[PDB]
Amino acid sequence: MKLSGGVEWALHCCVVLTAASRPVPAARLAELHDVSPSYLAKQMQALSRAGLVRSVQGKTGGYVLTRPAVEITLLDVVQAVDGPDPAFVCTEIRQRGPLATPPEKCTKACPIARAMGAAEAAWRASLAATTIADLVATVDDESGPDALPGVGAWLIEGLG
Amino acid sequence: MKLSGGVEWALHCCVVLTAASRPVPAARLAELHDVSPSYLAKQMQALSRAGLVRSVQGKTGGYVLTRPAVEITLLDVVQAVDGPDPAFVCTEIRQRGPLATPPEKCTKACPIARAMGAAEAAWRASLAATTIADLVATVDDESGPDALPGVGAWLIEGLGHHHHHH
Ligand code: FES
Ligand code: FES
Ligand SMILES: [Cl-]
């Protein structure tokens, strides 16, 4: 199964933005992670279209989270970058060939499609149960309480 | 996310092979699902490499399941076709840039990596909990108990006849 390569970068960007007390340009986030500015901007633009970040305009501008970290799930961020479409796409092959499912018996989804859907629901539910706030609390505990504030200070420095 | 297109066909083939009392050629499975025999043979070869089917040789050969339906999970079939590699691969981006987390504090996997790994473990656990036998029981209930036996009869009908009239 393939997942958008943007997900790692986008989740890291959401975590460090919680520590920024002012808007952070995409270029500064890109410098932090030593990644293509253009590539990271595309991920921030996907987060913007999903209403998770807002681009504040001006030379004092850059990205901010649109709501508290506790209200942003990992599923919110992953679906922003990877998309909401199901991984398993049923193309109704049960309706093909000489012993095709009777048309009146196609009101329920294929049992195979339903089983694949249940697995995707388990993946989504796992991501929905964790927030950016949860990731921050883990980083505080594992890296220490000054790790993310240090990143935050670095991200906003030179602006004020 | 995105799964290999062969998965839908492969799962359907495993279900209908439970109803067949003799080997079923890829071309006969392909006729049942109205699909290119070469395309379907590619999916059956993936199932063969994973040890889930065997291609029996000779005039009355074809594919057979290698163990009972209750011993074949959806995860077995999906990994056979789509592959076992994780969807999310951590590339240790925490170890990049001017504030890079040094290895000393990288004794554990990144919290983000652990969360993504937990979600994939949940997807795998769901697919591992359902067998081909479970799908057959659902079909028996929803299509009626003659549906899959009828498919099995059709799949084995007139096998070994390859010299068709001009
Ligand atoms: S018709 Fe699509 S999974 Fe069965
Ligand atoms: S370093 Fe890879 S997910 Fe955080
Ligand atoms: Cl916050």
Automatic annotation (TrEMBL), chain B:
UniProt-recorded name of the protein: Rrf2 family transcriptional regulator
Domain of life: Bacteria
Gene3D superfamilies registered for this protein in UniProt: Winged helix-like DNA-binding domain superfamily/Winged helix DNA-binding domain
Matching Pfam families: Rrf2
Keywords, ordered alphabetically: 2Fe-2S, Iron, Iron-sulfur, Metal-binding
Any one Gene Ontology cellular component term annotated for this protein: cytosol
Lineage of origin: Bacteria, Bacillati, Actinomycetota, Actinomycetes, Kitasatosporales
Residue positions binding [2Fe-2S] cluster: E8, H12, C90, I93, R94, C110, A113
GO MF entries: 2 iron, 2 sulfur cluster binding; DNA-binding transcription factor activity; metal ion binding
